Structure 1
Amino acid sequence: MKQLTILGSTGSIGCSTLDVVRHNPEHFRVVALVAGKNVTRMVEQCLEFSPRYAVMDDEASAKLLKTMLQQQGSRTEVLSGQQAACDMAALEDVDQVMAAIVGAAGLLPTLAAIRAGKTILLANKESLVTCGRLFMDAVKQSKAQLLPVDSEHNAIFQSLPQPIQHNLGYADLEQNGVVSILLTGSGGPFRETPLRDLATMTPDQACSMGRKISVDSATMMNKGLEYIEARWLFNASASQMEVLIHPQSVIHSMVRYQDGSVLAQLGEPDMRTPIAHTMAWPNRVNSGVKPLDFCKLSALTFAAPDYDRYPCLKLAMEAFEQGQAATTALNAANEITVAAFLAQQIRFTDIAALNLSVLEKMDMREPQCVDDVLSVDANAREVARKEVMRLAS
């Protein structure tokens, strides 16, 4: 029986993880749920899943949650705040931690699961985008298993040989006959826009979808960040990474082997797939996802990314070579500039341009701990806000 702590239970990943649990009650049991301020959805989850613990962001939410759980007869014990969330991530009889709290708030709880030697269903980009070296060192030192839940990394991982899958952070790609990792992305809505029109695209043209990630997919900042992550996670050099546009997103990513073989994972866009794969690894369970119907697909195509069309993708690649200050700064800047584009303060092409300008303006030492990473992030947001103000009168 796998016992689970779900960090970020009330977002789509958390609900989807719960759907796997709901349909596999003989294999998984929820011990702890952690969320933010969504008391109502947390009530329903505690009543369906009977975890021992639930944690909210603050005392106000925790008190509401307590009152409502109590009204319904629940035995779930209610806590609040960051430490409590780290504590659930490290609980003694927990086997797996779904690490789905995103942003800076996901860093310490994910690191607490790692240092407790858990199996971490990794479902946030900040861990490896901002703290990849810190976190990969902690994984080695603490004997944690990372299992990537993100669609492209989960596909690479399914496509990697068993000795790498079980030894992330140590495994040598080359020694295991791996030539490169083929990280695929859709190329976004402006994949075929003449370059000259990029300057004038609007937030509606760039975006059912998720507006930030949607813009990140238009700039391919999203693949840029996936590139930074994959290199830490899979221990890949620059020459062991290829980024390929694949507009249909049926192939989720691939791995190229020494004999010419390429292994690929394919599927529906439903996150229950990669989530169930990690929960059940090295075995499988039913996820509720429809079997992929190959007779109803668009033709599958591929093309090389053009860095004049996708300067963010190139910027992410160069930031990796500059270290975790640089990838942390790029990520934070990009949150500010995308937000500005979406609020109609700057042009679409000013995302990449101001992302570049913010990195050019910083000169930060390599972070040595999480606090350092938060300090780079805070600083880069400030440099970014000011650049936005320079353009947005």
Structure 2
Amino acid sequence: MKQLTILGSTGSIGNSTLSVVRANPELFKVTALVAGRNVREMAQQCLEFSPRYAAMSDEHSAKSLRLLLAEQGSDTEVYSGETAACELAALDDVDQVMAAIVGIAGLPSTLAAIRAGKQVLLANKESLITCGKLFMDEVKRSRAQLLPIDSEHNAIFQSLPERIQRQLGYSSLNENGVSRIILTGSGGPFRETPLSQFSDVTPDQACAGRKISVDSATMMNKGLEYIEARWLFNASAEQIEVVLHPQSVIHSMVRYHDGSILAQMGTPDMRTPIAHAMAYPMRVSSGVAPLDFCKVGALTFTTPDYQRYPCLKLAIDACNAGQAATTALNAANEISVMAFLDSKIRFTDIEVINRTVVEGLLLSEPTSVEEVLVIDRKARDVAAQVIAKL
């Protein structure tokens, strides 16, 4: 019987997590929920799952929630603010914390769950993109157990030995028999587009949410998954490669010393890796029909060409350059993408802008959230500057 705190409960990952709980009531108890300002949805979740605690992002939201709950005679205690969220992430009786507050704003609560020794289900990506060293050092310090919920990281996790799975990101891949992690992805809608057509890609062509569309066409999404993966799995540059797999049947793979490659497959569904993570080392049922091998297309593979995906190369370079570089790249990219979606720059200008920012860098390695914030803001400025000027 697991006690849960869910950080970022009203969003998509929040609801999927709650969905698993709803299907497995004897396995999972919700102790605490933390959300932003969506009072209507948070009330509905508190009324269904009876948490002991709830926290909103601000006092005004908390007060409206307190009213809604009190009308139903609920027992739930309501708080607000970042400190409250951190406290709920560290409660004694809690076994499992879903860290799904998005953006850099998600760092402090994530880090509080990690600092409390909890099983942490990692749904926040900036933690590792921007201050991986601080996060993974805190992991080793507290022995916290990380479990990735995004499909690729979750497939690498399942393709690894228990020994590494239970010592996530602070055990040696090599000593434990791992030769290299194989991070896979589809290559986006432009995997076969003639290179000459890239300069003409429009927002509507990349877009048929919107920013994630663009990140998956540039492979920035894969680049970010790459950097988080070097931190999550304690891998060097030589211990990871990226392979294209158009059909998205394999989710990712792991090569071992003797030649063996273990791979995880399954029909694409958000809930599956969440449910794997939450139930681990048990398994519980899915909604979706099991993958049928007579109905998958043939499975194919390639190597990503840097001419076609220069952002990928850029994210690797940024990775090897350090955390200030990846913080900056991440921030720069957000600006680039909106600028593209706002028809201000060409599709092909994204890498250029991003590279300019990354290579213009000369700041120290960040060692806290505060220093990450500084770099993030500087990088948005320079990126915006670099945009305006062409």
Question: Counterpart of 2:389 in 1: which secondary structure?
Answer: helix
Aligned counterpart, 1:20: 20
Greater alpha carbon shift after TM alignment, 381-390 vs 139-148: 381-390
Distance 2:69 2:183 in 1: 44
Aligned counterpart, 1:204: 204
- The alpha-carbon deviation at position 361 of structure 1 amounts to 2.0
Question: Counterpart of 1:154 in 2: which secondary structure?
Answer: helix
Q: 1:159-213 CA deviation, whole Å, 9 max, x = no partner?
A: 0011111112332111121110000011001111111111111111112x82111
When the two structures are superposed, what TM-score results if normalisation uses the length of structure 1?
Answer: 0.97
Distance 1:194 1:143 in 2: 49
Q: How do 1:106-185 and structure 2 match up within 5 A?
A: 106-185=106-185
- The alpha-carbon deviation at position 360 of structure 1 amounts to 2.1
Distance 1:88 1:338 in 2: 35
Aligned counterpart, 1:238: 237
- The alpha-carbon deviation at position 59 of structure 1 amounts to 1.4
Question: Counterpart of 2:297 in 1: which secondary structure?
Answer: coil
Aligned residues of 1:225 and 1:316 also touching (Cα < 8 A): yes
Aligned counterpart, 2:313: 314
Distance 1:369 1:59 in 2: 26
Aligned residues of 1:272 and 1:289 also touching (Cα < 8 A): no
Aligned counterpart, 1:275: 274
1:357 pairs with 2:356: yes
Aligned residues of 2:139 and 2:170 also touching (Cα < 8 A): no
1:108 corresponds to which letter in structure 2? P
Distance 1:289 1:143 in 2: 34
1:286 corresponds to which letter in structure 2? S
Distance 2:240 2:42 in 1: 40
- The alpha-carbon deviation at position 102 of structure 1 amounts to 1.1
- The alpha-carbon deviation at position 73 of structure 1 amounts to 2.4
Aligned residues of 2:115 and 2:139 also touching (Cα < 8 A): yes
Aligned counterpart, 1:84: 84
**Alignment: residue pair count:** 390
Distance 1:343 1:71 in 2: 45
Aligned counterpart, 2:368: 369
Gaps spanning 5+ residues in structure 2: where?
none
Q: How do 1:242-321 and structure 2 match up within 5 A?
A: 242-321=241-320
Distance 2:106 2:288 in 1: 27
Alpha-carbon RMSD = 1.1
Question: Counterpart of 1:383 in 2: which secondary structure?
Answer: helix
Aligned residues of 1:87 and 1:112 also touching (Cα < 8 A): yes
Distance 1:4 1:148 in 2: 16
Question: Counterpart of 2:294 in 1: which secondary structure?
Answer: helix
Aligned residues of 1:188 and 1:218 also touching (Cα < 8 A): yes
Question: Counterpart of 2:175 in 1: which secondary structure?
Answer: helix
Aligned residues of 2:131 and 2:367 also touching (Cα < 8 A): no
Distance 2:298 2:373 in 1: 44
Distance 2:242 2:307 in 1: 15
Distance 1:127 1:381 in 2: 18
What is the aligned-residue identity percentage? 72
- The alpha-carbon deviation at position 40 of structure 1 amounts to 1.1
1:337 corresponds to which letter in structure 2? S
Distance 2:286 2:89 in 1: 24
When the two structures are superposed, what TM-score results if normalisation uses the length of structure 2?
Answer: 0.98
Runs ≥4 residues deviating over 4 A: none
Distance 2:199 2:186 in 1: 20
Aligned counterpart, 2:52: 52
